[PDB]
Predict the structure.
Amino acid sequence: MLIVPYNLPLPGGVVPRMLITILGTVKPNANRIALDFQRGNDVAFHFNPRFNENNRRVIVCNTKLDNNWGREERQSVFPFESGKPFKIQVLVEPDHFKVAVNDAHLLQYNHRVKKLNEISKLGISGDIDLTSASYTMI
């Protein structure tokens, strides 16, 4: 019920205890999903499930500064399935983003961009139907 790519403003940036919830369904022949938390043109946190990287499924996380990507962090645990509904929750903690998928902890990504109050947009793109995207404080 939302068009993709979708831009979710995060007014005044992110803060610890902010919880972002994304609901949708992975398309049948998906290749990728991406969440991009942006500070202007920089990408503070790129979360990128890849369904076919050399015939493996992997999640890649990274940061883009001044148009250059940094050191990737990869993990092999892959909770997504083509064609099925998902829930992603991103909880902002003091020293990392914490990601849970379908109510199970997936990964943490330590803050490389330290001006959290300038991370003011979340872009959501890739091979999904997007149902809802929202945030709250816990």
The chain has one domain: 1-138. The radius of gyration is 14 Å. The longest strand covers residues 42-53.
